[PDB]
Amino acid sequence: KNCSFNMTTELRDKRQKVYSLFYRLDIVPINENQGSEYRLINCNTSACTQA
Amino acid sequence: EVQLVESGGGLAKPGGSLRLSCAASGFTFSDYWMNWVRQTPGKGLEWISVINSYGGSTHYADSVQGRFTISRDNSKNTLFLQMNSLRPEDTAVYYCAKVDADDYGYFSTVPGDLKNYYFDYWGQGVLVTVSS
Amino acid sequence: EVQLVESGGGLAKPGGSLRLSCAASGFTFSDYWMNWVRQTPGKGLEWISVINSYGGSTHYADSVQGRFTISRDNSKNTLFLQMNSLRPEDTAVYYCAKVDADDYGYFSTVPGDLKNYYFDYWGQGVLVTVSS
Amino acid sequence: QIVLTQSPAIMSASLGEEITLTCSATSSVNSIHWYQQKSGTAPNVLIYDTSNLASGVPSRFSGSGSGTFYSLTISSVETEDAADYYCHQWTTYPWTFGGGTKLEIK
Amino acid sequence: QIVLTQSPAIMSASLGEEITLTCSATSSVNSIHWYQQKSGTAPNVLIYDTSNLASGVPSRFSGSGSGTFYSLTISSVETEDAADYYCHQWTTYPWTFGGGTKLEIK
Ligand SMILES: *[C@@H]1O[C@H](CO)[C@@H](O[C@@H]2O[C@H](CO)[C@@H](O[C@@H]3O[C@H](CO[C@H]4O[C@H](CO)[C@@H](O)[C@H](O)[C@@H]4O)[C@@H](O)[C@H](O[C@H]4O[C@H](CO)[C@@H](O)[C@H](O)[C@@H]4O)[C@@H]3O)[C@H](O)[C@H]2NC(C)=O)[C@H](O)[C@H]1NC(C)=O
Ligand SMILES: *[C@@H]1O[C@H](CO)[C@@H](O[C@@H]2O[C@H](CO)[C@@H](O)[C@H](O)[C@H]2NC(C)=O)[C@H](O)[C@H]1NC(C)=O
Numbered sequence: 001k002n003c004s005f006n007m008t009t010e011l012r013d014k015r016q017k018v019y020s021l022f023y024r025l026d027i028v029p030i031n032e033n034q035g036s037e038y039r040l041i042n043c044n045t046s047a048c049t050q051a
Numbered sequence: 052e053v054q055l056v057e058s059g060g061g062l063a064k065p066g067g068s069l070r071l072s073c074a075a076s077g078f079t080f081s082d083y084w085m086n087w088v089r090q091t092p093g094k095g096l097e098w099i100s101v102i103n104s105y106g107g108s109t110h111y112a113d114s115v116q117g118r119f120t121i122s123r124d125n126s127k128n129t130l131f132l133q134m135n136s137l138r139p140e141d142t143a144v145y146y147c148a149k150v151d152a153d154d155y156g157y158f159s160t161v162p163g164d165l166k167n168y169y170f171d172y173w174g175q176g177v178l179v180t181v182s183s
Numbered sequence: 184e185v186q187l188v189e190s191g192g193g194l195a196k197p198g199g200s201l202r203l204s205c206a207a208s209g210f211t212f213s214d215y216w217m218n219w220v221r222q223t224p225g226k227g228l229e230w231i232s233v234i235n236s237y238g239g240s241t242h243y244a245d246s247v248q249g250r251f252t253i254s255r256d257n258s259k260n261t262l263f264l265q266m267n268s269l270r271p272e273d274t275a276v277y278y279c280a281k282v283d284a285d286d287y288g289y290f291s292t293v294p295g296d297l298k299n300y301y302f303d304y305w306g307q308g309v310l311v312t313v314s315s
Numbered sequence: 316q317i318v319l320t321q322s323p324a325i326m327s328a329s330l331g332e333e334i335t336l337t338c339s340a341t342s343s344v345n346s347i348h349w350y351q352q353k354s355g356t357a358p359n360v361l362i363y364d365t366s367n368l369a370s371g372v373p374s375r376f377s378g379s380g381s382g383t384f385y386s387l388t389i390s391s392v393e394t395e396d397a398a399d400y401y402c403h404q405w406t407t408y409p410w411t412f413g414g415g416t417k418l419e420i421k
Numbered sequence: 422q423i424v425l426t427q428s429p430a431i432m433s434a435s436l437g438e439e440i441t442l443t444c445s446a447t448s449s450v451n452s453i454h455w456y457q458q459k460s461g462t463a464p465n466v467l468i469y470d471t472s473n474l475a476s477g478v479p480s481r482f483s484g485s486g487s488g489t490f491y492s493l494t495i496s497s498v499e500t501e502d503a504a505d506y507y508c509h510q511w512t513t514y515p516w517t518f519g520g521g522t523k524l525e526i527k
Pocket of ligand 1: 126160
């Protein structure tokens with residue numbers, strides 16, 4: 001899935017818009033009716049750590 | 052290639068209302084801004100409004116603030132500009148253009164802010180005016 | 184129980200001004216949103232405005248944007264709708280209703296956003312129109 | 316913008332006759348709330364979240380649906396059931412209601 | 422607010438004649454984009470970011486500048502070059518263009 005989301009940049013007052021590819025398995029929508037808005041699979045459990 | 056056409060412009064009533072239109076294809080219209088400029092007969096080019104991606108803001112010019120409004124439909128990839136209380140001095144050859152690159156990058160408030168924008172692709176010259 | 188009444192509606196001047204009113208009791212009015220709907224004579228129901236729990240950041244319909252403004256007084260647990268430039272085609276049986284549950288929960292920008300809202304308690308049918 | 320549409324607009328039913336009311340929209344919504352109003356009265360709610368019925372309403376009213384198609388089912392029709400019904404959406408703007416459906420005793 | 426101004430307003434050049442177009446502003450900008458338009462056509466872009474030329478445009482067009490002074494240099498002038506040019510700014514509001522410069526074959 002070609003995702004697009006907002007993200008805070010190095011400037012604390014500014015942000016940045018990026019895009020990245022994520023698998024469907026690590027993608028969970030907020031609800032099953034809206035569509036096109038999703039979240040990470042592990043967001044309501046804990047915050048992952050990038051290796 | 053990038054193919055874009057515009058329609059809806061033409062004769063109208065002085066001080067009444069009219070709604071322009073512009074269609075785009077060949078690219079991700081939801082990730083690119085849209086600008087509306089005007090070229091009066093025999094003079095230079097004039098910019099009047101700009102619409103941001105996702106319908107964030109609608110920064111206008113001082114001569115058209117409160118009179119005209121720009122809206123977009125990313126679902127249908129159609130850009131329509133609403134004209135209200137247009138006067139005969141507002142006659143010009145309006146153009147529908149697209150910015151240089153997409154909004155993906157650093158920004159302050161609206162997603163496409165702080166990015167080198169130059170009109171690279173334009174449409175057909177439509178004439179908008181009012182008469183009897 | 185929930186008891187709510189509304190007043191202030193009636194005859195007015197075409198294109199003039201008028202101010203509606205609505206009082207609520209029996210619940211925490213400062214935490215529940217309020218909506219103003221209108222039912223034209225013989226036709227269906229139509230919605231025109233909504234107000235937050237704190238009063239700010241209100242949303243209106245396209246047919247009433249810029250004409251009618253909604254405000255509330257949480258200190259007196261009252262709600263009043265301002266009517267400006269009302270036309271004779273705007274005649275309808277207005278109603279004052281309350282949402283299902285209070286704004287406590289998840290939200291994006293305004294506190295009551297993203298919440299199942301359905302009108303469960305209504306007031307009395309007030310008639311607002313203009314004449315000679 | 317989403318636009319709702321009900322069908323049929325006008326229906327006639329007798330006492331104890333099984334009927335079905337439907338509401339449709341141009342886009343998918345989370346749920347549809349059904350209503351009923353009488354001339355000069357306040358519109359009351361009967362079925363919310365498409366499956367849960369309101370408190371104190373009769374059990375004759377029922378409804379179900381998903382996606383862009385929704386419906387209202389009235390198992391038994393009485394004299395008081397002759398009124399005007401509506402369907403309301405909450406997912407996106409402008410929170411508009413349905414087209415309205417008038418019911419009259421046959 | 423920033424206001425742009427071009428100079429000269431009207432110029433006449435022959436075939437193969439070296440000319441120079443300039444654009445100025447009341448405040449410093451990051452870059453100035455040069456354009457060209459013909460009666461009834463769409464304005465095309467030629468030089469962007471003050472140094473990079475557009476794709477497919479002839480190499481006869483060139484330009485440079487910094488601060489509040491910018492310029493456009495045309496090494497060779499042909500018959501098709503007779504048109505109206507402009508300069509556009511993007512740093513601050515209101516994103517206005519230049520004063521316009523008309524070119525005619527001498
Ligand atoms: C990164 O962050 C930015 C900045 O917040 C986000 O940009 C916002 O995105 C939202 C969501 O798309 C934009 O909201 C859009 O606005 C339009 C309607 O706006 C009018 O009404 C609102 C109040 O309701 C006013 O604030 C506003 O001035 C306008 O009067 C619609 O065009 C949009 O879509 C809606 O309509 C269409 C057609 O009916 C439907 O298809 C849609 O589902 C939806 O109903 C939408 O609501 C908002 O304007 C943006 N800016 C700001 C400053 O908030 C980015 O989205 C975000 N990026 C990511 C990837 O998350
Ligand atoms: C975290 O969020 C996930 C995703 O919503 C939850 O998992 C869902 O739980 C519901 C509970 O009714 C199930 O019906 C769904 O099938 C689950 N999966 C999905 C993809 O929606 C999860 O329960 C939440 N909490 C925790 C502690 O993990």
